Scaffold this active site. Structure first.
Site, mmCIF file in Angstrom:
data_model
loop_
_atom_site.group_PDB
_atom_site.id
_atom_site.type_symbol
_atom_site.label_atom_id
_atom_site.label_comp_id
_atom_site.label_asym_id
_atom_site.label_seq_id
_atom_site.Cartn_x
_atom_site.Cartn_y
_atom_site.Cartn_z
ATOM 1 N N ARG B 4 23.763 42.660 38.670
ATOM 2 C CA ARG B 4 25.128 42.990 39.082
ATOM 3 C C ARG B 4 25.293 44.426 39.625
ATOM 4 O O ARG B 4 26.362 44.795 40.097
ATOM 5 C CB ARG B 4 26.147 42.653 37.977
ATOM 6 C CG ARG B 4 25.941 43.352 36.641
ATOM 7 C CD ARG B 4 26.830 42.796 35.519
ATOM 8 N NE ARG B 4 26.437 41.446 35.116
ATOM 9 C CZ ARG B 4 27.167 40.355 35.309
ATOM 10 N NH1 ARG B 4 28.366 40.428 35.908
ATOM 11 N NH2 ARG B 4 26.688 39.180 34.905
ATOM 12 N N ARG B 95 37.130 44.141 22.481
ATOM 13 C CA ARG B 95 37.308 43.475 23.790
ATOM 14 C C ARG B 95 38.770 42.997 23.876
ATOM 15 O O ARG B 95 39.160 41.974 23.275
ATOM 16 C CB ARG B 95 36.310 42.311 23.933
ATOM 17 C CG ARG B 95 34.868 42.816 24.130
ATOM 18 C CD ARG B 95 33.764 41.776 24.036
ATOM 19 N NE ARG B 95 33.723 40.791 25.122
ATOM 20 C CZ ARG B 95 32.774 39.867 25.256
ATOM 21 N NH1 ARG B 95 31.781 39.806 24.367
ATOM 22 N NH2 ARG B 95 32.793 39.009 26.282
ATOM 23 N N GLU B 99 38.583 39.724 31.428
ATOM 24 C CA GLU B 99 37.183 39.865 31.835
ATOM 25 C C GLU B 99 36.843 38.979 33.039
ATOM 26 O O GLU B 99 37.349 37.854 33.137
ATOM 27 C CB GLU B 99 36.268 39.522 30.656
ATOM 28 C CG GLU B 99 36.473 40.455 29.464
ATOM 29 C CD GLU B 99 35.619 40.097 28.255
ATOM 30 O OE1 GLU B 99 34.858 39.106 28.346
ATOM 31 O OE2 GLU B 99 35.767 40.795 27.219
ATOM 32 N N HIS B 101 34.310 36.598 34.978
ATOM 33 C CA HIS B 101 33.265 35.648 34.578
ATOM 34 C C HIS B 101 32.668 35.015 35.821
ATOM 35 O O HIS B 101 33.406 34.697 36.780
ATOM 36 C CB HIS B 101 33.941 34.584 33.649
ATOM 37 C CG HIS B 101 33.156 33.313 33.437
ATOM 38 N ND1 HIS B 101 31.904 33.276 32.850
ATOM 39 C CD2 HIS B 101 33.495 32.021 33.677
ATOM 40 C CE1 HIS B 101 31.485 32.018 32.792
ATOM 41 N NE2 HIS B 101 32.438 31.237 33.281
ATOM 42 N N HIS B 102 31.344 34.855 35.834
ATOM 43 C CA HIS B 102 30.680 34.045 36.879
ATOM 44 C C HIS B 102 30.527 32.602 36.455
ATOM 45 O O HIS B 102 29.856 32.307 35.450
ATOM 46 C CB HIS B 102 29.326 34.623 37.307
ATOM 47 C CG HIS B 102 29.443 35.930 38.005
ATOM 48 N ND1 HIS B 102 29.572 37.113 37.330
ATOM 49 C CD2 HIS B 102 29.615 36.224 39.324
ATOM 50 C CE1 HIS B 102 29.746 38.106 38.198
ATOM 51 N NE2 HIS B 102 29.764 37.591 39.418
ATOM 52 N N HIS B 126 36.089 33.759 27.142
ATOM 53 C CA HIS B 126 34.794 34.157 27.713
ATOM 54 C C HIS B 126 33.589 34.070 26.750
ATOM 55 O O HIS B 126 32.458 33.637 27.143
ATOM 56 C CB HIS B 126 34.874 35.575 28.285
ATOM 57 C CG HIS B 126 33.823 35.868 29.303
ATOM 58 N ND1 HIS B 126 33.592 37.136 29.791
ATOM 59 C CD2 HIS B 126 32.970 35.047 29.968
ATOM 60 C CE1 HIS B 126 32.634 37.089 30.700
ATOM 61 N NE2 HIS B 126 32.235 35.835 30.826
ATOM 62 N N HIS B 130 30.094 31.397 26.742
ATOM 63 C CA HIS B 130 28.677 31.755 26.725
ATOM 64 C C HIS B 130 27.949 31.352 25.447
ATOM 65 O O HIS B 130 26.722 31.477 25.353
ATOM 66 C CB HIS B 130 28.507 33.219 27.039
ATOM 67 C CG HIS B 130 28.764 33.525 28.478
ATOM 68 N ND1 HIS B 130 27.932 33.088 29.484
ATOM 69 C CD2 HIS B 130 29.778 34.187 29.084
ATOM 70 C CE1 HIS B 130 28.409 33.489 30.651
ATOM 71 N NE2 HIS B 130 29.529 34.156 30.432
HETATM 72 ZN ZN LIG Z 1 30.686 34.907 31.989
#
Ligand SMILES: [Zn+2]
EC number: 3.1.-.-
Lengths: 83, 132
Positions: B4, B95, B99, B101-102, B126, B130
């Protein structure tokens, strides 16, 4: 100075809240730390919602937020500001 | 160190969104990048994904239909390119902000700057994505 809300005069507490509301910080990380600090001082169950997601009719200006905290603490058996 | 951090050009269409845009961030795959934001950022070159993220929030701060649904304090934050705070119940510890996210992960070949592969998520949503 920074360990409990009773270490703040009302005026100093307004300065903290003003700094958060205006995002008057050097980095995003520094702002997040300040918001966490605010939550620990107020002990209000709504947490950062007092700053970012006010209840209907609630004044989310810095002075408005300080009032809401001052009243909540007073109504709920907790110590208040210095002097 | 990380993929990234390599420069790239933003691409993709995004999707129409409404007043409920950020409510979608705590559900399913997250909220899409608005078509309106994608129009502003398309073909621009970004030094890192973090630079792209700053750009998204700055465009939200200038967008009437997208900013109208943030309070004065959150507005101050996005004007600086900071991510806006979520409601407390969507935060997880330190957090506390929305956020990016991909959808197809970069580690799995997903595109870094393709806006059709990017979603807005709350921390709670998020993390769950994951963890499977
Ligand atoms: Zn993500």
């Amino acid at each position: 100075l920074k360990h409990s809300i009773s270490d703040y005069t009302e005026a100093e507490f307004l300065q903290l809240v003003t700094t958060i509301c205006n995002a008057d910080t050097s980095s995003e990380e520094e702002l997040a730390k300040l918001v966490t600090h605010f939550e620990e001082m107020t002990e209000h169950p709504s947490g950062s919602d007092l700053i970012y997601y006010p209840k209907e009719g609630d004044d989310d200006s810095p002075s408005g937020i300080v009032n809401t905290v001052k009243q909540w603490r007073a109504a709920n058996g907790k110590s208040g500001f210095k002097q | 160190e990380s993929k990234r951090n390599k420069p790239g050009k933003a691409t993709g269409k995004g999707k129409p969104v409404g007043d409920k845009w950020l409510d979608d961030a705590g559900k399913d795959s997250g909220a899409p990048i608005p078509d309106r934001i994608a129009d502003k950022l398309r073909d621009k070159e970004f030094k890192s994904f973090d630079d792209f993220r700053k750009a998204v929030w700055e465009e939200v701060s200038k967008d009437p239909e997208l900013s109208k649904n943030l309070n004065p304090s959150n507005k101050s934050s996005v004007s600086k390119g900071y991510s806006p705070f979520t409601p407390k119940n969507q935060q997880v510890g330190g957090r506390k902000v929305y956020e990016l996210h991909h959808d197809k992960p970069i580690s799995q070949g997903g595109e870094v700057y393709d806006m059709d592969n990017i979603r807005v998520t709350t921390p709670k949503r998020h993390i769950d994505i994951h963890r499977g």
